[PDB]
Amino acid sequence: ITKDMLPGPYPKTPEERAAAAKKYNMRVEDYEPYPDDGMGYGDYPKLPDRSQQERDPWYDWDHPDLRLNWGEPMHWDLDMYIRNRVDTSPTPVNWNLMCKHLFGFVAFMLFMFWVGETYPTYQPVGPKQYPYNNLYLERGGDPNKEPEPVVHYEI
Amino acid sequence: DAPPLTLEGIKDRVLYVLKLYDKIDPEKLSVNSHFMKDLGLDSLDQVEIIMAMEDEFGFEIPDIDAEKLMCPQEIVDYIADKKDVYE
Amino acid sequence: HAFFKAMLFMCSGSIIHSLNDEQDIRKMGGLFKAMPFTTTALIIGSLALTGMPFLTGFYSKDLIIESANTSYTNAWALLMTLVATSFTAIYSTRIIFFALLGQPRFPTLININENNPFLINSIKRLLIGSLFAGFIISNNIPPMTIPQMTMPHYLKMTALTVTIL
Amino acid sequence: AFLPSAAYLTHQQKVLQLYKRALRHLESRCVHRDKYRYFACLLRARFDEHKNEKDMVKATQLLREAEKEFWHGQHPQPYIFPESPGGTSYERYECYKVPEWCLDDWHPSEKAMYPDYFAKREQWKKLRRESWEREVKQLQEETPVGGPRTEALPPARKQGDLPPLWWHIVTRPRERP
Amino acid sequence: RHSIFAFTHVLIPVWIIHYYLKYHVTTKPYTIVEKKPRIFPGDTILETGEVIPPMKEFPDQH
Amino acid sequence: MNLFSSLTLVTLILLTMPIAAINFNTHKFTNYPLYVKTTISCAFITSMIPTMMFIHTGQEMIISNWHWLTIQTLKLSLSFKMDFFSMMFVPVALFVTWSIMEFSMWYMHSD
Amino acid sequence: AHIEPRYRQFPQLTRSQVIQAEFFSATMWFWILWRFWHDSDAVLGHFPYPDPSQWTDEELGIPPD
Amino acid sequence: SKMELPDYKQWKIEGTPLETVQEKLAARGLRDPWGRNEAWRYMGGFANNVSFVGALLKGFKWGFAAFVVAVGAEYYLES
Amino acid sequence: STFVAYLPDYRMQEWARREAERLVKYREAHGLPLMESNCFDPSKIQLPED
Amino acid sequence: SWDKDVYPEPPRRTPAPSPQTSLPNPITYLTKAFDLLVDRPVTLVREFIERQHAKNKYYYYHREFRRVPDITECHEKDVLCMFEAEMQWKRDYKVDQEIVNIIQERLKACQQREGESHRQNCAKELQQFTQVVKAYQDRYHDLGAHYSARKCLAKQKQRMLAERKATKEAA
Amino acid sequence: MLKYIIPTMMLMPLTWLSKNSMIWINTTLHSLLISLTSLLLLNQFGDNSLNFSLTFFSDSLSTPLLILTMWLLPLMLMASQHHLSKENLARKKLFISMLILLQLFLIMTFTATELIFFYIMFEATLVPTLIIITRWGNQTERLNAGLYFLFYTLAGSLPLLVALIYIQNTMGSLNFLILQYWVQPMPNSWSNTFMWLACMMAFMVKMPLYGLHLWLPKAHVEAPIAGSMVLAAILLKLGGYGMMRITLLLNPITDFMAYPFIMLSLWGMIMTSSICLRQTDLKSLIAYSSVSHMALVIVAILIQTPWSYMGATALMIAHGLTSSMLFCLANSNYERVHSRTMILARGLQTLLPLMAAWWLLASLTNLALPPSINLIGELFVVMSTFSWSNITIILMGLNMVITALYSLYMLITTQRGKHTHHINNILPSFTRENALMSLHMLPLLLLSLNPKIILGPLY
Amino acid sequence: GAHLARRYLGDASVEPEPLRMPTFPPDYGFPERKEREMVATQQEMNDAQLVLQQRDYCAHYLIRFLKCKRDSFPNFLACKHEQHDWDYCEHLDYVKRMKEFERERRLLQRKKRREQREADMA
Amino acid sequence: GKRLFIIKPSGFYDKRFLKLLRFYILLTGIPVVIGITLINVFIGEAELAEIPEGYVPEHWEYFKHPISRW
Ligand SMILES: CCCCCCCCCCCCCCCCCC(=O)OC[C@H](COP(=O)([O-])OCC[N+](C)(C)C)OC(=O)CCCCCCCCCCCCCCCCC
Ligand SMILES: CCCCCCCCCCCCCCCCCC(=O)OC[C@H](COP(=O)([O-])OCC[N+](C)(C)C)OC(=O)CCCCCCCCCCCCCCCCC
Ligand SMILES: *C(=O)CCCCCCCCCCCCC
Secondary structure (H helix, E strand, O other): HHHHHHOOOOOOOOOHHHHHHHOOOOOHHHOOOOOOOOOOOOOOOOOOOOOHHOOOOOOOOOOOOOOOOOOOOOOOOOOOOOOOHHHOOOOOOOOHHHHHHHHHHHHHHHHHHHHHHHOOOOOOOOOOHHHHHHOOOOOOOOOOOOOOOOOOOOO | OOOOOOOOHHHHHHHHHHHHHOOOOOOOOOOOOOOOOOOOOOOHHHHHHHHHHHHHHHHOHHHHHHHHOOOHHHHHHHHHHHHHOOO | OOHHHHHHHHHHHHHHOOOOOOHHHHHHHOOOOOHHHHHHHHHHHHHHHHHOOOOHHHHHHHHHHHHOOOEOOOOHHHHHHHHHHHHHHHHHHHHHHHHOOOOOOOOEEEEEOOOHHHHHHHHEEEEEEEHHHHHHHHHHHHOOOOOOOOHHHHHHHHHHHHHHH | OOOOOOOOHHHHHHHHHHHHHHHHHHHHHOOOOHHHHHHHHHHHHHHOOOOOOOOHHHHHHHHHEEEHHHHOOOOOOOOOOOOOOOOOOOOHHHHHHOHHHHHHOHHHHOOOOOHHHHHHHHHHHHHOOOHHHHHHHHHHHOOOOOOOOOOOOOOOOOOEEEEEEEEHHHOOOOOOO | OOOOHHHHHHOOOOOOOHHHHHHOOOOOOOOOOEEEOOOOOOEOOOOOOOOOOOOOOOOOOO | OOOHHHHHHHHHHHHHHHHHHHOOOOOOOEHHHHHHHHHHHHHHHHHHHHHHHHHHHHOOEEEEEEEEEEEEEEEEEEEEEOOHHHHHHHHHHHHHHHHHHHHHHHHHHOO | OOOOOEEEOOEEEEEEHHHHHHHHHHHHHHHHHHHHOOOOOOOOOOOOOOOOHOOOOOHHHHHHH | OOOOOOOOOOOOOOOOOOHHHHHHHHHHHOOOOOOOHHHHOOHHHHOOOOOOOHHHHHHHHHHHHHHHHHHHHHHHHHH | OHHHHHOOOOOOOOOHHHHHHHHHHHHHOOOOOOOOOOOHHHHHHHOOOO | OOOOOOOOOOOOOEEEEOOOOOOHHHHHHHHHHHHHHHHHHHHHHHHHHHHHHOOOOOOEOOOOOOOOOOHHHOOOOOOHHHHHHHHHHHHHHHHHHHHHHHHHHHHHHHHHHHHHHHHHHHHHHHHHHHHHHHHHHHHHOOOOOOHHHHHHHHHHHHHHHHHHHHHHHHO | HHHHHHHHHHHHHHHHHOOOOHHHHHHHHHHHHHHHHHHHHOOOOOOOOOOOOOOOEEEEOHHHHHHHHHHHHHHHHHHHOOOOOOOOOHHHHHHHHHHHHHHHHHHHHHOOOOOHHHHHHHHHHHHHHHHHHHHHOOOOHHHHHHHHHHHHHHHHHHHHHHHHHHHHHHOOOOOOOHOOOOOOOOOOOOHHHHHHHHHHHHHHOOOOOOOOOHHHHHHHHHOOOHHHHEEEHHHHHHHHHHHHHHHHOOOOOHHHHHHHHHHHHEEEEEEEHHHOOOEEEEHHHHHHHHHHHHHHHHHHHHHHOOOHHHHHHHHHHHHHHHHHHHHHHHHHHHHOOOOOOOOOOOHHOOOOOHHHHHHHHHHHHHOOOOOOHHHHHHHHHHHHHHHHHHHHHHHHHHHHHHHHHHHHHHHHHHOOOOOOOOOOOOOOOOOOHHHHHHHHHHHHHHOOOHHHHHHHOOO | HHHHHHHHHOOOOOOOOOOOOOOOOOOOOOOOOOOOOOOOHHHHHHHHOOOOHOOOOOOHHHHHHHHHHHHOOOOOOOOOOHHHHHHHHHEEEEEEHHHHHHHHHHHHHHHHHHHHHHHHHH | OOOOOOOOOOOOHHHHHHHHHHHHHHHHHHHHHHHHHHHHHHHOHHHHHHHOOOOOOOOOOOOOOOOHOO
16 A cells, blocks of 8 residues: 555545546546535545445355445445445335325324224123122231221122 | 256256247257257247246346357256256 | 244245245145145144134134123224234135145245154144143133123124134 | 446347346236236237337337336235345355365364365365466466456467466355355 | 163252252242142141131022 | 252253253264253153142242342342243243254254 | 155155144044034033113112102 | 156146136237146146145044044943 | 352351341340331430521 | 241141042152152262261351440541441441341242232231331431441431421421 | 562563563463462451551452452463564563553552552553553554543643642541541532542543543554553553542532533443444444443442442443453454454354354353343443433433444454455464453353452442 | 214213213112122132132132142043033123113113103203 | 265364363362362361350351361
């Protein structure tokens, strides 16, 4: 390695842009660095921002695990777009329709759960009757305090 | 499990699948018979042949290798190289 | 559920291993006579899952839905539990129809074999479990809660009617 | 437009790949063989109707509308072969594909358990190290000015020599180690 | 050697941990605490011989 | 009392012993999966005995055998709870694991 | 010894597995029929359900006025 | 090691729904050249598969016979 | 590990149990409460006037 | 052995076995097998071990701590007395912690022993646990990680000042 | 404590009068003997601490740190004898003397009964560490790492000394045994505010604190293996020990004062775990994990409850052992592939099975799998901070997930997947490396059996 | 199940609610009503370790069934007659609860009729 | 039956390390556990007794196990 192969400041002159494109091993027309807004990116190229799952899996890749070649410029977020991580594959259904359908499904069933909680179902019976003043001593009540007499009558 | 495949078995299977094709008469084709000139097939017929062998052998041939396969000996050699036969 | 679900996965693994590591149901079929023991055990497990009377699944699921019917519960949850029971029946017979019946769809080289003693013995033991263990456990356990037995006719036959539908 | 040997996909390869993908998705849509055969014959008619179209931009527009038609009605979960990428058995045995050079690090005590195999390995290494300079000189005298244009490698055009860069492709681990 | 597995895998650990429970766990208080056995009417206590009287005569319904 | 706790702890010890067996190997194990399967079957029988003990009598146990850590008011001790749930779950899980390991001995033969 | 694989024909079957499958299916159906014959109450219903509207007025303590 | 294959000439589509497909295509006007390749699935031992209700009723005859025998036996022993 | 395992009554953690085993057996025998709410005796402590 | 008074246990009442059916339960047979194969060898080995113990008998004693003056009779910034008061307070702190542990053991043992009727049959253990927890919270809680005798004395003084204020406002 | 200082000082005539190539053997043997004799410090009483003389005393808090230091020295000599095989004999003896001197200052720091003596040794640990980092490192940035490591710490520690001297003019003494009985409450004022800042910011810097942690990713990834071990496992605990000693004098002003630092650490654990989720370097990942764990220890000390103190010391010991093991793993991988990139060497399980087992075990102990002492310490800190407030558990719980999101990730990218094709210098695992990892892990797994010796001075 | 439709989709002032019953006095309309009698003693129910929900008004059948199940080991299907007796008793209890529900509904309907008559005359 | 060579990394060094680790652990593990068992069986444990009048125990006489006393 040597000094003039490491990344540097943002290129301004077209000659510096061509030198940076030759350093990063691609065409000058395809070399688009990050905009110099002062975020610290520098002269690193702005790759088309897609995951490694969208690459060709049948190609003889140098690194078939990551689907990457040798000497090709890596993405700034290559650790995010590996196959172990976030995928940007084209879905058969549009994103907005999927999100709206899922939110409507969840919201509708939550609303119907609340409505059913408002109006419960039961069976036409009275309360269950337990003996000995509704089991006052068996519910952990103190034996000194005599409970209020609850009497259940035959029906 | 997974019985081994020999070159004779692969050639017999590819000749069987090609013989069960109505566009190819069985009395003229050979193992070194080209699809386009010797048998007068079509590109769509070549795709049908490739997917027939794919469904026969239970593994998928990529398109970049499927477009260059035009003769049964080439198919035998490709399947032999992929399945690592004759060890 | 542990009993019949373990045995169902065992049958599915036997079918997968007999079809050269294929886990897709769209490339199956015709295995009713190719693997008879796996067919029998899969049918028994699906019947026990759906709520076949007096199997393992009857002695737990039917009591569960009877207690859920005649209780002070949410109506919407009960309705969705009934719909989910119907859907369990639906996908169980979907597995039975696609994986086991119809016409063959696997590749031509047939290497179907299940006659090893280990697989046969394990499926046999889990089959005996999925036939009798629910009855044995339900007759052996002591009571802890009062079971519900006074229910109207339309609520008693609800699970069987929904499974049949 | 990502190919190992070529730089682009022509019209014919695009039509053939679209036909193959459409037939595979149609096979995934209808489970049974007879229904798939009927609809595959129907699709073959649909593709054969517009075969002899000499207008190039009309062929391009037919390709675009056929691609939109395929994207509109493809299966959400198409059938994938087990060894194909995205399959259930894809790259499963990569945990057993031990590279060959690990055999160079074996102890001499365990190297004596397979004498003849290691003798043949030594012969293979001698062949590779005696053909390496010849094949790199073949490569350096055949590559044009400005580097190679494509990734296609030249064969062995002489008698007694081997094709260049043959080691890591011949000695790759098997699919079932 | 047909009963090696029935001896070195069951009997020896049973001996070891029965010794451990009898002379080192039950020695310390409140280590092994057991639910009391169920007492039903009509039973007889083994400890002191008392008999639990039977229940009141049932008002039969069937 | 001296049979319930003894049989359940010897079930636990019998199940944990083949890990110590495989951790102290020098040669290649001769039919190690068969050894594990036999161990699990024996442990299933040894667990099935206190299950019918609980079915007959209704005995529940708490085995606080090893005093591990007293931190001010809190005391953490190795305590095992034998009740309805443990006694009706352990033989079922052991039977399922026995069948699963026989099936895996068939299925995972080539690995 | 073992079962030789066959190409695009019906596979070779073992008599023992066919006998075992038929025996286990017969055992399942016999168990179901036997339990439905003997128990017969867990399916159709354990107890009759009286009509709440059929109860008479004087046994419910309804004061007539 | 050596797997011999059966004769190719027996694979005809007769008696199979592939002739129904052939009749539909011939009424429309096309050909189905791949019928003979898939003719093996519909003929031989894989033909005439059972229905779903016949699949659920596997072994019902012997089970019914055993149930009748056991009921008669318990009726004899209860007397 | 053998030396650490056989440490002679680390931080008297056993001893504080055993003395407690005595002490409860004192105050349960004579009807005293198990623990008083005041750590020190209220008779020997002076409060500021308020 | 342990102390039956500080670790109480209610009298045990096991009902006699009165079987109804003629089928022999396997529990009695396995109990006989356990008593023959297992109990006798373990008993013999333990008897041999105790016989070997009986030849050489030596004693260990419980350490006795005499009473030293507490922090209420220590002068300000005189280390030679507040030191001893601090260590006595630490020993009393550990003894109190183990007392609460003993009461917790009693409560858990009662709850597990009395079974499904544990809510009624263990009221006394629950009330003793509540009393000892109230005493421990009023004596030692909220002192901090750097607790000492002076912090506990200050907390107690604040508690009696609040109690005096409350009983003055009610009279 | 004179029975441990004298053999440590005599280690230097051992390493300077040894043979041409017998320095490593003799130093390892005699340092292991010192580590064996270090177990006599376990004579702890439930009320009284072990007081040796007017200068040295050992409580139940300093004892585990002393045992860990004297155990770490032979492991350090074993770790740092592979990349120094090409070194000069005089430079090798100088390196061993530097390690011996650093260990001597460390074991004299923890036993100091005087806060001035403790502070003097606490700054005397700076010089050998800085010399090791700036001399025996590998990259260029070590020179920059020699500045951020230094001028941070002194910037926290030079005001603090003044505050300590103020105590010498106020309470009359700085002896810790005296100050436990002569302590006074601290009223709320600006003077006591800035005295609290002076007495605490040195220990926030050396722990480190989020915001002031910038020296730690720089001084961990340029330093050699011995320097990485000494920063990760011991030198980050000087701040915790100083906090635990100095919190006694700063009451009750700490109740409303600890709020911004508690919020800083409670957000810094999430920030550093998220940073660990995206780090491209193994060494930087281990450094940021150390920052997160020490922020947790900062929260535990600042809330000052007994459970928090217990969890703090358990977390300190467990994190020291685990971080030392992880750094030795990273050093072995760096020595085998000659780079620090995580994504470079993948699929090492197919080549090193035993190193894969060690990696799995170290990652298991990193995410605090029970019943390891990592889970004991982290659990007790969680209980104490739930007692402090009922919402902080959320700020704990999410953090736990992110821990399990990177440690296993640190496993997977280094162990699983298809191996790289162009790397063919992967040697089999040496006996020395495996001995190092077993000596790192077996005490950590054994301490789960008897954790009562690492549960602080109020157990 | 029709009572849910009568209460929700109809009028809730006539249909009784399950949360609070009874609202009518038990001595209204019933000349000299009789109280239910407990057979199982509190001590017998206490030392049998019955579950608190299992301690209904005829737990003596449950005690007898548990004793028979304990004393007929290992024949677990020997004495299902006690189980049938317990099931019949709890069915009778459910019938009594249904009778109480119907009584409350009819009394509420009578009260509505009474106020409707008061509205008619006034 | 056409046996194919299985390529694997050299496990000789890891096996050697594990064998050496087991040997060097057991070399002092076995005598320590043998001595501990012989002490527990023959020497045995102490007994709790009240302190007699006129006698004060030694500082090592308050512990139960012989190893703890030593
Ligand atoms: C296969 C060969 C087996 C061995 C053969 C030879 C020996 C034969 C049998 C005799 C053994 C010796 C006599 C009996 C045992 C000694 C009795 C005794 O008092 O022992 C001292 C103690 C008993 O406890 P203790 O109450 O005496 O000690 C308390 C000590 N203080 C007060 C300081 C806290 O230890 C044992 O008995 C050992 C128990 C081993 C089983 C548990 C192992 C756990 C491993 C994982 C650790 C982490 C757990 C995390 C979870 C914790 C819970 C939440
Ligand atoms: C401390 C700070 C510095 C840290 C680094 C230190 C470096 C130097 C290290 C020096 C040596 C190690 C010192 C610490 C030793 C800790 C261990 C110790 O002695 O503990 C004392 C404890 C003491 O137990 P105890 O306290 O309960 O007993 C009372 C005390 N005695 C022993 C006197 C009666 O030892 C044990 O608990 C040992 C129990 C027996 C052995 C283990 C039996 C079970 C084993 C596992 C069985 C299978 C389980 C399931 C497995 C499933 C698969 C995974
Ligand atoms: C009376 O009609 C109320 C019955 C209980 C609430 C409704 C339950 C609905 C689901 C069970 C019956 C399903 C019949 C197909």
